[PDB]
Amino acid sequence: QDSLSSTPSALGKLQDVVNQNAQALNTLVKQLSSNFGAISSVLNDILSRLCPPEAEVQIDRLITGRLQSLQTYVTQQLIRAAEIRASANLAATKMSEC
């Protein structure tokens, strides 16, 4: 009780999981600010300024980038999930055996 009450870094193993997930979500949202080669990151700006033949080209650039950003996110979550699963499997074993 005294050790935990006096050591800020004691629970880093749990804090790291919280931090890594928060950094992945914030990264994903920030990618919505990316132009990906388009005239603007804001989809409404494209639709309000240009008509259909030139807007579609600009939109395709945002779709390509945003789809790529989301695919990156999900792949990382699957890899991270696998690591957490192994940790949970170990914890379950310790509960049974300790």
Partner: protein, 49 residues
């Protein structure tokens, strides 16, 4: 009535007003009407500084 030369082109500032571009784009008097970064048919509901 008179227009400036190309070497000494004239600049007129437009501000503090409402603009109707429907008289310009739909005019038959123009040989060229080329817009960059914006559609002339959508320009009629945009705002500028």
């Amino acid at each position: 009535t008179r227009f400036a030369s190309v070497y000494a082109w004239n600049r007129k500032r437009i501000s503090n007003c409402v603009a109707d571009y429907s008289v310009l784009y739909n005019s038959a008097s123009f040989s060229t009407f080329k817009c960059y970064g914006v559609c002339p048919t959508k320009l009629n509901d945009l705002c500028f500084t």
